[PDB]
Amino acid sequence: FRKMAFPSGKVEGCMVQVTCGTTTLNGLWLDDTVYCPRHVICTAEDMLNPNYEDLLIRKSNHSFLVQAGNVQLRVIGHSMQNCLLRLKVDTSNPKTPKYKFVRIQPGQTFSVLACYNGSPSGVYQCAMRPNHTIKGSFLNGSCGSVGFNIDYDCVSFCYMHHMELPTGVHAGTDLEGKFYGPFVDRQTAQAAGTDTTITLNVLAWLYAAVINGDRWFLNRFTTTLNDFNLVAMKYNYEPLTQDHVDILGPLSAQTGIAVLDMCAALKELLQNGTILGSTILEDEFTPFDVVRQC
Amino acid sequence: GFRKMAFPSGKVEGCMVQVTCGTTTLNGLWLDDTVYCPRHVICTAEDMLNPNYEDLLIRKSNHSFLVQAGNVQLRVIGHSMQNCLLRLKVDTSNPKTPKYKFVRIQPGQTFSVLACYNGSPSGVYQCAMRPNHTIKGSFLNGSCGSVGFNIDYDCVSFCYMHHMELPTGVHAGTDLEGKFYGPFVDRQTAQAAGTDTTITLNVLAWLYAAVINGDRWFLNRFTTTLNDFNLVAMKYNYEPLTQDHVDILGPLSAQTGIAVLDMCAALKELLQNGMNGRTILGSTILEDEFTPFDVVRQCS
Ligand SMILES: */C(=C\C(=O)OCC)[C@H](C[C@@H]1CCNC1=O)NC(=O)[C@H](CC(C)C)NC(=O)c1cc2c(OC)cccc2[nH]1
Numbered sequence: 130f131r132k133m134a135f136p137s138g139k140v141e142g143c144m145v146q147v148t149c150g151t152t153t154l155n156g157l158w159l160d161d162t163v164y165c166p167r168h169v170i171c172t173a174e175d176m177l178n179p180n181y182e183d184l185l186i187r188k189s190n191h192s193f194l195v196q197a198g199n200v201q202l203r204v205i206g207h208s209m210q211n212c213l214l215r216l217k218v219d220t221s222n223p224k225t226p227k228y229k230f231v232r233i234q235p236g237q238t239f240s241v242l243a244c245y246n247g248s249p250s251g252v253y254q255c256a257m258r259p260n261h262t263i264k265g266s267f268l269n270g271s272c273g274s275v276g277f278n279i280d281y282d283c284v285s286f287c288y289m290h291h292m293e294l295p296t297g298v299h300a301g302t303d304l305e306g307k308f309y310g311p312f313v314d315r316q317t318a319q320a321a322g323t324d325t326t327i328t329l330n331v332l333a334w335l336y337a338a339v340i341n342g343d344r345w346f347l348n349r350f351t352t353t354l355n356d357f358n359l360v361a362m363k364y365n366y367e368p369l370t371q372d373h374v375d376i377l378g379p380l381s382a383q384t385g386i387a388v389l390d391m392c393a394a395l396k397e398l399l400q401n402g403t404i405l406g407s408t409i410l411e412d413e414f415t416p417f418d419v420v421r422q423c
Numbered sequence: 424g425f426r427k428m429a430f431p432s433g434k435v436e437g438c439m440v441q442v443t444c445g446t447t448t449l450n451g452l453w454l455d456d457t458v459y460c461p462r463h464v465i466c467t468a469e470d471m472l473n474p475n476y477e478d479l480l481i482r483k484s485n486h487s488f489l490v491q492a493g494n495v496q497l498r499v500i501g502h503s504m505q506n507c508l509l510r511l512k513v514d515t516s517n518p519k520t521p522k523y524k525f526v527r528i529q530p531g532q533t534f535s536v537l538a539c540y541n542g543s544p545s546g547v548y549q550c551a552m553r554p555n556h557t558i559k560g561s562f563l564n565g566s567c568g569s570v571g572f573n574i575d576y577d578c579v580s581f582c583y584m585h586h587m588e589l590p591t592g593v594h595a596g597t598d599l600e601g602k603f604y605g606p607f608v609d610r611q612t613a614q615a616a617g618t619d620t621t622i623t624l625n626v627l628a629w630l631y632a633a634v635i636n637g638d639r640w641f642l643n644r645f646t647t648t649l650n651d652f653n654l655v656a657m658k659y660n661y662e663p664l665t666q667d668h669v670d671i672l673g674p675l676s677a678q679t680g681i682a683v684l685d686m687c688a689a690l691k692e693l694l695q696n697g698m699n700g701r702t703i704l705g706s707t708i709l710e711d712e713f714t715p716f717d718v719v720r721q722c723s
């Protein structure tokens with residue numbers, strides 16, 4: 130079982146650069162719209178606490194330089210949607226895949242296509258942490274890079290990059306421009322809440338261990354979901370929802386281990402303290418990631 | 424931040440095709456008017472046990488091969504064997520062929536793998552060519568013909584084509600000239616690799632990535648000569664560090680302010696004492712699959 134990115138080609142064909150003045154970031158070109166972080170309109174004086182509405186008043190369609198490589202795509206309209214700009218261009222991207230905009234939940238994994246000046250440089254797998262940050266790898270010029278999943282040739286875009294917190298973790302928005310977490314797009318040091326371990330993914334990792342024959346940790350006990358949640362919160366683990374148990378359906382059926390019986394094994398591991406070669410429980414592989422690469 | 428990062432795979436996705444001979448199907452790479460694929464596509468399940476490839480190939484003609492790019496059949500107009508690969512000449516040229524090179528990568532170097540099934544890309548991840556000439560990848564049934572590559576300024580350097588999984592779970596394959604990395608052969612037999620060693624240059628590059636990312640606990644005032652470091656490294660099954668390798672670490676040494684030999688002294692203590700329950704970049708072991716190039720690309 131390994132950490133892998135989705136093939137990025139469908140997303141590479143949508144990356145452009147958006148420039149305002151001397152400030153260039155990345156944009157996502159789908160049909161005749163380019164989506165990009167709104168802070169592209171900021172100068173070093175506006176950045177501390179920008180008044181985006183007032184700043185946008187002094188911007189027209191002719192202020193935006195949108196390029197696919199060095200080829201200019203003319204802007205014929207512009208609007209703001211939460212923390213993004215939606216720039217209407219005069220050319221419909223012929224490389225637009227079948228796509229959706231999705232707002233992911235904590236625990237969920239996605240691929241990130243890191244881009245600089247509209248040019249993709251790398252692709253890696255990320256998980257949305259319970260504190261609404263991602264442990265990414267981004268440098269200056271990376272804003273506007275997107276996160277996505279691909280299911281049956283449909284690209285579900287879930288993330289657009291905007292910020293690096295003082296701790297080194299990253300923060301961004303969904304493709305409607307709404308931040309994940311309590312963060313804001315301004316040049317300030319913003320702290321993320323205390324992070325927790327992703328319970329759903331640790332359980333998946335345990336099932337993946339059982340599928341490969343590593344099952345020493347299983348026991349002859351069971352627990353209620355409520356009693357597991359009460360113990361989990363004392364160990365910094367996320368509580369489990371009715372949905373979490375339902376998504377674990379496939380793995381539970383495959384190994385013959387009931388979800389609640391697995392929680393009892395995880396509950397004993399938390400109270401008492403290798404599995405798949407590691408001393409620590411992996412929490413960035415979802416039940417879907419285990420089922421998919423089985 | 425610091426993670427395993429693959430090259431964007433789009434330039435390679437546009438080259439992936441499916442190759443079928445009877446009921447045997449695997450992936451091929453379509454560049455200009457040629458499709459490259461593992462030669463074991465000509466085998467039935469029984470032939471794979473002990474193949475005489477020249478005999479199996481003379482029994483096939485151009486019509487024996489069915490090449491599909493998505494849902495469109497590409498007509499085979501020529502065929503030849505180049506080591507463990509087949510070169511199928513097709514009647515059309517791939518317009519999506521990027522600028523490319525074929526390279527035989529050296530141990531310790533990394534590359535991206537685009538895992539494909541039935542001619543369709545499924546996932547992309549980074550691998551390192553181990554000193555024992557295997558790769559620790561992730562491949563399932565139907566993945567043969569999947570390729571490894573690097574990208575440098577729009578140019579794709581293809582270095583690997585997938586053929587086998589050893590009983591230990593590691594993988595074996597060839598370069599794009601069809602020559603296997605290591606002492607492996609393309610038959611249905613259980614095969615062992617030589618004893619592996621740790622890629623010292625990569626561990627040192629990764630310790631520099633840890634210091635760049637704020638993990639410094641392993642640094643100390645201990646010092647070492649290049650020879651005294653290599654004596655310890657060899658004792659622990661690590662590759663010797665040459666002066667050429669010390670020179671490669673120059674830019675990472677300048678960025679962190681930690682002398683190369685001082686980072687060697689830190690590694691020597693980590694080998695001799697262990698990590699004592701502590702972690703480095705969220706790992707309990709010393710990572711050797713990041714090259715100095717991989718570190719600088721992500722950390723500067
Ligand atoms: C993307 C901006 C970009 O590409 O602009 C093109 C000119 C960066 C992404 C960062 C850069 C380093 N790694 C990343 O992930 N975003 C920013 O620089 C933010 C811009 C905001 C939205 C206007 N700012 C920050 O991430 C930011 C600012 C500050 C602080 O200030 C003071 C203090 C601490 C941390 C911090 N982070």
Ligand SMILES: */C(=C\C(=O)OCC)[C@H](C[C@@H]1CCNC1=O)NC(=O)[C@H](CC(C)C)NC(=O)c1cc2c(OC)cccc2[nH]1
Binds near residue numbers: 564566585608612
């Ligand atoms: C790719 C072949 C393919 O796609 O063919 C389509 C019909 C597989 C890749 C393997 C499958 C599981 N993970 C992988 O990486 N290659 C093979 O199966 C090899 C075929 C050879 C080259 C003709 N064979 C092996 O890898 C192989 C055979 C055996 C053994 O036998 C007996 C015993 C132990 C291990 C082993 N590995």
